[PDB]
């Protein structure tokens, strides 16, 4: 009985926009930041996980802001991740 | 007598897209998510193993939702790997 | 009772115009450097921390040492950030 | 009385590539997969060691196998490496 | 009472480039190598301190050897830095 | 009394045109392959250390064979390196 849903993510080229994105994803929905990761060729992905509407506001925020500093390569919102997808997701914590 | 078939595998430009590919790969499919490596230039590489069948409808449902978000370099399915390529497998574990 | 507002960045193509950008934050306004980051493909960010009028002076400043010598990617300032966003700032301190 | 011929070599832009290239190297003769290393720009590289003829073959048909799937940035038979060589080799075993 | 002026940077593409420079800087001059980073995107810099008329001279013997044989990104002379770019300055002795 | 001239470099892109460079440059001239560096953006240095005439020849030869399999960077030989550009080859060891 050990103890750790809606995953959303945004990718910008530039570690400023990803802050950008970060602070308004926090800031406009009842998300936790959960994931940050740098995989080279400047692009940068923060996640952030919680209720299913809460994420897909959160993901839109962050793109709006992202969008009006850098470049924004890509967005998504997985609903309900598959379990495994969790041992990708843990090695961005 | 030391106990540890098919490989699966989606190169994309940038995280995002190869989560989800991941996530694709792991719900339309019985296969296991082994691999995951960055290696720079932003391509980001997600290996699944499973039998045959089930690695190739992995990699062709995850190139579609990959393929939706960002950009997908290449896609292979090794049907039986040669032993000696697991040496390499095992580093991106 | 634990002891630790306003967040400047500023992220050029390469480190010599990012070095021009922090002396020039520091010279023009009362600011600490508090961040410093390369990514990869060449982005380096430097992140000044101070009140909000003394932020903005900083980032103009360091905008206009860093942009003649050098490619400045891109430039923002936070005046508020999210607690969650300090998460992300100090994993670059 | 320390103990530890030809070398071939295929670099590849992206992983995919280089581990179809591989398993084609490995498959095709007899050939031991003794190198393997990713220095950025996705280029990555896998090295095989064996008789001369043997390298030959195993590059010939690592070549036809990668080229179909990715790009290959090139490849090389080393018939007689110079043993100073080995100091470099070794790094990426 | 602990004891640990001017700054010369040279930023070039390719590390041959930059150690032409810092070769050059040295000869040239009375001045100390005291930095070396390489940041991606083959952006090396090379720095040196000394006084201002030294590093001045040292700055501009190192362009021209440098711009013979590469790319030179940048190259700045920074007088009197400010105190706290002594610690980016630092993480690049 | 501790005890540990003239220094070759050639920089190619790719790992596989180096390789070729080092092995032609051992081969053709009495050197010594003392560096070996990657630094980003597929840039890979070798480096050799010997007599002048033997680090000119080896270069040369280094050179000649790299350009038929990949793309030489560039290439120099530095006579008599500063002493102060020790501190920066051993980084390369």
């Not at 849903?5 to 530039?14: N, Q, V």
């Not at 839109?60 to 969008?67: F, H, K, M, R, V």
């Amino acid at each position: 009985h050990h103890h750790h849903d809606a995953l959303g993510l945004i990718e910008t080229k530039g570690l400023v926009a990803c802050i950008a994105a970060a602070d308004a994803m926090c800031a406009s929905a009842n998300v936790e930041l959960i994931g940050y990761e740098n995989i080279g060729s400047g692009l940068v992905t923060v996640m952030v996980k919680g209720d299913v509407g809460a994420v897909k506001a959160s993901v839109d925020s962050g793109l709006e802001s992202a969008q009006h500093i850098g470049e924004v390569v890509t967005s998504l919102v997985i609903a309900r991740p598959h379990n495994d997808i969790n041992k990708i997701v843990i090695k961005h914590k």
